């Protein structure tokens, strides 16, 4: 039970935590880059859209940029962030 904390790769064990400010689950990280949990992964991890954290394994990652100031991630226009699919460990 040792977790990655940045530069996340497929196969990494990660801690998925609730981020109230961004109203989403994210990967716990020491980097300022946000790694949001992809909404598709919530059922697999027995989470809902609360459990404060769960351990998971990264399955897929996609790099995104906010094109609108009003967005589901509550990030500024132009923010680059990741969406990560994960499964329970």
């Amino acid at each position: 039970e040792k977790i990655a904390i940045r530069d996340f790769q497929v196969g990494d064990l990660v801690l998925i935590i609730l981020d109230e400010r961004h109203d989403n689950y994210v990967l716990f990280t020491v980097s300022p880059t946000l790694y949001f949990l992809h909404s598709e992964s919530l059922p697999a991890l027995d989470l809902k859209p609360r459990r404060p954290w769960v351990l998971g394994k990264v399955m897929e990652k996609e790099y995104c940029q906010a094109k609108k100031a009003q967005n589901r991630f509550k990030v500024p226009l132009g923010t680059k962030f990741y969406r990560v699919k994960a499964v329970s460990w």
């Binding site: 790099y63 995104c64 940029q65 906010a66 094109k67 609108k68 009003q70 967005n71 589901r72 991630f73």
Partner: peptide, 6 residues
């Protein structure tokens, strides 16, 4: 259209 893959 809120975000796009880069």
């Amino acid at each position: 259209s809120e975000f796009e893959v880069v």
